[PDB]
Structures are given as structure tokens and as C-alpha cells.
Symmetry: C2
Subunit: 154 residues, 2 copies
């Protein structure tokens, strides 16, 4: 598979039919449909950059994820910064504790689309640029931090 | 102004407060708050690549536009291609007539946020890879083609 780009990711919008997402992403040339999700690849390295898309029962888009398509520009995440986050904090509080440039916009979900309540907004904040590097993960539910975790961060 | 990027544009989400959009976009180093909208610039050219952001009465984001942040990857639009389109087309019908690779996702807007209907989704489809090339412009309203035009397509 090949050809799934940032530009195609930015064309894909919530509420789009599975068939429309598939076509805009590059269809058979770019994507694999695994029922639970579609995975669309930048290039033939399946460990490389990719987008994942998930749908509700009406086959409308409710969840976008991306890995390495929009990388954190300056990955420098450390415990000192992780320690400044807490359950319940707002997005504004979070971005005052953690620099935006150390985090990638991992996922955006509207499970109840076309309703926008219960929005899930996820970030991965890597310690360095290397694939599989220790990173912190954060999830916001309607703008409040509901999960924070890290594995082996320095 | 300088420094606005595709990665910052992809971090910015509907419903975000003006203050948060401003922060994530790069604030005064990259952006001008023109009251009616915020404009954020990749480079010191006021007509260089840029993102535009507009807000509702609650100061929450309802409208994103971009020029040259995610260009049409393969501009090929011709007059004959334009003539294949017709008002009332669905997005699927449109993309069977016009290749996605010749169109840029110019704007996305949810005027009724947090409701998601009345969605306006705009495309510009250039004939060549030059800034402000001869182009067609299209608007979909909740997935139906409601505006189409072109000037000087070959």
C-alpha cells in the first residue's frame, strides 16, 4: 500500500461515508479495510506513517487517528513535564504545562456524530523522534483530561 | 509573521476557544487577529501559505480555511471536467467526475456548532500548479453541491 498523505488526511471529515473516506484516502492502492477500522498507509512500510479511520453502525466516520503523518515537531517529552499534568485539567491548562511542539495530535473522535458531545481528543508526546520511543499519552473528554499515562519516559 | 504549519492547522479543532486556537497557531509570531477572522502565515508573504479561523458569538471555532498548506497534489482541472459537474451532485458523484488530486480542501465550516448540519465544505480545483491558477470553485452544503463556478479553465 502507498500514497496516503497529510493532504488526504485533511480531506477526510466526520460524518463521511465509509465509501467516501475509502475513495479519498486512495482506496485499494492505499488502504486495508479490517472491519473494525480502515488503515491507510503513506508507503509500503507498514510500520511507517498511516491513518486509521473508524465508523459508526451507519458507516459514517466517527474517529480519525494518525501516526507520523503530523509528527510532533520537537519531541522532548520528559517526566518533569508529565508531572505537571493531572486528571481533570482543561486543554488550556494542559498546553501551559506541556509544549504543543512536543505532542502529536494522535486522534480525534466524535462517537455520537452528528452530535458532538463526548468528544475524545488524544495526544502522544514522544521523548525523542525515534520510532517506538517512550512517550506520554493523554486523552481529553469534552476538553477535560480523563487519561494520562506513560511507559518508560525519562 | 512566519511559522504556521500544516501540523498546527491539524491541531486546531471546531469548538475550540479563540484563545486556544491563537495559542496553538503560534500567536503573534505567526498570526494576525483581524477581529472578523484570525489569519496565520507560513511565511512573511501575506499571500503565502496560510490558515484562516472564524468564530461564533461564544468565541468558539466554526470555520477553517487554508491556502497552500495542503495544495491540490496534481492540478489538472479543465473546462471539460468542470462541465461534468452539476448542482445537486453528492460528493460521491462529484469525485467520480473530478479527480480528488486536482482539488484542494479550501474550507470546512460548521455554522451551527455544536450542531453539525448546515455544513459548508469548499473545494478549489486549479488547472496548474501556480498560486491563484485558473480554477473552479465548489461548495457542498451537507454533502450536496450548491455552488459551482470557474473562470478561464483551459
Amino acid at each position: 500500500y502507498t500514497g496516503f498523505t497529510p493532504e488526504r488526511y485533511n480531506k477526510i471529515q466526520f460524518g463521511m461515508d465509509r465509501t467516501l473516506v475509502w475513495q479519498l484516502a486512495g482506496a485499494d492502492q492505499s488502504c486495508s479495510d479490517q472491519v473494525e477500522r480502515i488503515i491507510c498507509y503513506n508507503n509500503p512500510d507498514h510500520y511507517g506513517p498511516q491513518g486509521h479511520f473508524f465508523f459508526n453502525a451507519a458507516d459514517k466516520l466517527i474517529h480519525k487517528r494518525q501516526m507520523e503523518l503530523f509528527p510532533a515537531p520537537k519531541p522532548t517529552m520528559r517526566l518533569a513535564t508529565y508531572n505537571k499534568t493531572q486528571t481533570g485539567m482543561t486543554e488550556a491548562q494542559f498546553w501551559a504545562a506541556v509544549p504543543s511542539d512536543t505532542c502529536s495530535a494522535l486522534a480525534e473522535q466524535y462517537p455520537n456524530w452528528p452530535a458532538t458531545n463526548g468528544n475524545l481528543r488524544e495526544y502522544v508526546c514522544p521523548s525523542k523522534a525515534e520510532r517506538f520511543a517512550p512517550s506520554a499519552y493523554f486523552t481529553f473528554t469534552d476538553g477535560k483530561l480523563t487519561s494520562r499515562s506513560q511507559s518508560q519516559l525519562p
